[model samples]
Target: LHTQVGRGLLGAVVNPLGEVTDKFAVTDNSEILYRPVDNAPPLYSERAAIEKPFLTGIKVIDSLLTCGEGQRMGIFASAGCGKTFLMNMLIEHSGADIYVIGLIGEEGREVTETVDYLKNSEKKSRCVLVYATSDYSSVDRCNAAYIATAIAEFFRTEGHKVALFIDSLTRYARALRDVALAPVSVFDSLPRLLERPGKLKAGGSITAFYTVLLEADPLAEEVRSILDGHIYLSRNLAQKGQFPAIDSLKSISRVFTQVVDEKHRIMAAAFRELLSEIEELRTIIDFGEYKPGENASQDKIYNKISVVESFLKQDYRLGFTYEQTMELIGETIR
Candidate 1:
C-alpha cells in the first residue's frame, strides 16, 4: 500500500482475501476506473515512430543496449550476479520522467537497502518504490507487481515518461507457484503488464525493466518472447572481474535499432566489434601467439584494441551524462 498521493497515503488497500479494497470515499464505483485490459484500443493520433533514446548514463548500457521510451526490457542473472547493482545505476542515472519500482518477492535485507539507498540518493524525488518483501503473503506480493504497474500508469496518463522496475520477478513467479501451483496463464500476465507502458494515450511511455533470477533457468519462454529485449549476466564474466559482466552476444535488444540514432549506432557497433576482436586477441595471448593480423600493422591493431578496452571497462562510480557519452564514444572509435 505504498502508493504516493502527493505527501499523503499511496492510495492502496487490500482485503484479507487479497482483493483491492480501495473504493471511492463515501461511494463504491469500481467500474469508473476500470478499462478492460486487453480490449483497450490505441488512441486515435498521428503518432510518428518513437525515435528518442532513454539514456541510462552507463557507457556500456547506453552504448551497447540502449533503451527507449515504451520499451519492455528485462535483466536476467542468478544470485549475487550484480543485477541489483545495475538496477541501482539505472534508477539513479536514467533521464526518464519518472520511476516506478516494484519490489515484489524480494528479501527484507534487499528491500531495506534499496529503500534506504533511494531515500538517500539524489533522484529520490523522481521515483516511487512499491515494496513487498518475502515476508509478505503470496497474494500481497502478486498484487504488488500489479499495483506498481498501476502507479506507473498513473504517471503515464499524467503525460510523463516512466520507467517501471520489478526487482526479481522470478520470486513473484515462485510465490504464484507456491499458491496452489498456478497454471501457465499466470506467466502470461507479465507480457501484458509490459505491453501497456509504451502505448499509453498521451504520448507518454513506460520503459519497463524487470529483473529475473536464475541464469538460463527456464523461467518462462513465452514471457521472454513478448519482451522488447532481454539481457543476461554471465557469471563467468563476473568471475573474470568484469564489473557489469554481461555477455553482449547472449544479450539482444530488439528495439535498439529503432531507438539508437545513426551516429551512435555505428559507434556502438564499432565498440562491439572491437570487443569481439579483444576476445580473439585474449585467446591468442593465452596460447602465446600475439602477432598482428594479416591485413593490419601491429601498431594499428593494438592501438584500436587498447582504446576500446579502456572505454568499456569504465568505473561504476563515475557514470556518464549524454554529453560525456558522446565525447567518449567519438574518441573511442577514432
Candidate 2:
C-alpha cells in the first residue's frame, strides 16, 4: 500500500513459533527492495538551514523548549517524573498531520491508556502505535525504534508533517547494553535513528520527541550531544508539587530560537535568566545567607522568584496552543 497507493500503518499477527504474514513479506525484486535502517537516505536532502516551527501545545515547552520541524528532541527525567504523561499530552494536543509512537519496554496498561486517550480525543486515525513491552523478547524491543522510524519515514515521504514519539530509549539501550558495550552498539544507532526524521523536503518533515529515564548522568550527558535539544524534567520540582516539573534552566533547545517569534525571544531569554537567578537566590534563602533585619528585601526577592516560578510551571491536565501560549507567556513575563 505504501508504494502503490499512499502511506499507511500496517498490522499483522505473529505465528505461535515465529513468523506469518505476507503484509510484511520480504522481497528482492527491483520494484521491491530492502534498505538497512542506518544506510537509508533521509526523506530528502539539501534543504535550507532555516527550520520551521513545530508546536507541541505545551506553553512551557512551546515557549521555552521550542522545537522545529525535522528536529529531534529528547525528554530526560527520573522515574515517576511524568514523562510518559507529558508525551501523551503532546500526542493528544499537537497539531502534526501524522503521529507515530514507539512504546519500548513500557507496561501494557500504559499502552491501553494511550490508545484510549487517542480514541477518546478522536485522533486515532492520524496515529500509528508500535510497541514492544517488557514481556517481549529483547530483539523485539530493539527493533521497535526502527519499525517506528520506518513508519515515520513512510508518512513523511507522503508529504505529511510527522511527529514521532518514543516512550523510552533508555530501555532500548539497556537491552543493547546487556549484549554489548561497544560504541558501535546502540550509541552508533542514535545518529541513524535521528536521521530517519531529521531531513525532509517538499513541505514534509519529521519532528521526534523521545523520553528517557535518568539512570545516570554519564549516559545522559553523553547522549545529549547527539540530540538536537532536550527538555529536562526535575524530580525536585515534582516533589515540590509542580506538575510537568520541567527545569527551565536545565532544559534547553538549540532549535527553538530559530523558530520563536521575536516578541517571545526577549521575554523567553529573560525568563531563563530569571530562573537562573532564582536558583542562586534560592540557595541564599535556604542557607540563611542574608543577614538579620533584611526581611523587606527578602520578601521582595521571594515575590519576584515566585512570579518566575509560576510562569514556568504547567499542570499536565491543562493544554494550550502556541497562539494562546504566545500571549500568555508575554503577559506572564510582563
Candidate 3:
C-alpha cells in the first residue's frame, strides 16, 4: 500500500507513511517503487570507495573539509548555531540528482518555511520532503526518518545519486525515548539506519547529512563515532556574525584527502596554520601587551589572516564552483 507513490514523490510533500500532503494531485503508475523502511545495508564487498567529490558549493567545505559521494557527515552544534542555515545552503547548492529531506519533530513554522523555500527554488523538481512536526506522536516522528531513508534508497536503486538530509537526529532519538525505548536499544538501532550510506558497487550513492544537537551528549558521541566525519559549528563564530559558523579546527572530513587534489590538501593545512597564528596574536593584542610593529613578520601574517577569514565567510545566497573556490583561496593565500 505504501509503495504506490513512486516517482510521483518528487516535488511532493508527504507524511512518513508516503501519503501526499500537498494540494497537487499525484498519479502513482510509475514503474519505480518504494521499499521497506528498515531494509538492510549493502554488503562490504558490494560497496566502493567514495572517490567522487560531493560539492556543497560552500568555500570552507569544498576546499578544506571536503565531502565525498556516499559519505555520512554530521553537522554538530547547539541551538541557534546555524545548523539549519548550513543545511539549507547545502540543499540549494549541493547539485545532487535527488534529495530526500526528513523534518522530524520540527516546529510547524520551520516545516512550512522549508517547504516554501524549496517550492520557490529550482531544486524543488528533484526534492522530496518527508515531514512529521512536533505535534506528531513520538512513534510518528521516528517513522518519518525511516520513510525518508526508504525514499532515498528507492532513487539510489534507480541509478540516481541521492543526498539525504535529516534536519536533526537528536529529535529522532528523543522521540525514541519518549516512546519508552531503552537507551541501549536506541544506540543499537541508530547504527543500522546510519550504516545505509555508501557508494554502491553497481552504481549510485547516498550522501547523508545528519544534524546532532550538542545537548544530547550520549547520542552525540554515538552519532560521532558512526559517521565518517563531522562539521562542528561554533556558537562563538555565530555570535561574531560568521555565516555557516564552522569551527575549522573542530571540523574534520575523513575522506577529504581522498577526494581533493594535492594542491587543495596543502592549502587547507596552510589555512589552518594561519588561523591558529591569528588566534595567538588576538589573545596577546587583547591583553594590551603587544605593539603593532613589535614583529614585522607578525604584521604580514595578520594581514593574510584577515584576507583568509573574509574569503571563508561565504554568503548563503551565492554558490561557488569547485574550480572557482580553489582559485579564490589561492589568490587570498598568494
lDDT of each structure? 0.68, 0.69, 0.84
How many clashes (backbone N, Cα, C below 3 Å) per candidate? Answer: 2, 0, 0
TM-score of each: 0.82, 0.82, 0.94
Give the clashing pairs for model 2: none
lDDT of 2 at 140: 69
Worst 10 residues of 2 by lDDT: 13-22
Residue pairs that clash (backbone atoms under 3 angstroms), model 3:
none
The best-first sequence of candidates by lDDT reads 3, 2, 1
Give the winner by lDDT: 2 or 3.
Answer: 3
Clash pairs, model 1 backbone: 3-10, 70-198
RMSD of 2: 5.6
RMSD in Å for all candidates: 5.7, 5.6, 2.3
Ranking by TM-score: 3, 2, 1
Better of 1 and 3 by lDDT: 3
**In angstroms, how far off is 323's CA in candidate 1?**
3.1
For TM-score, candidate 1 versus 2, the one ahead is: 2
lDDT of model 1, residue 126 = 69
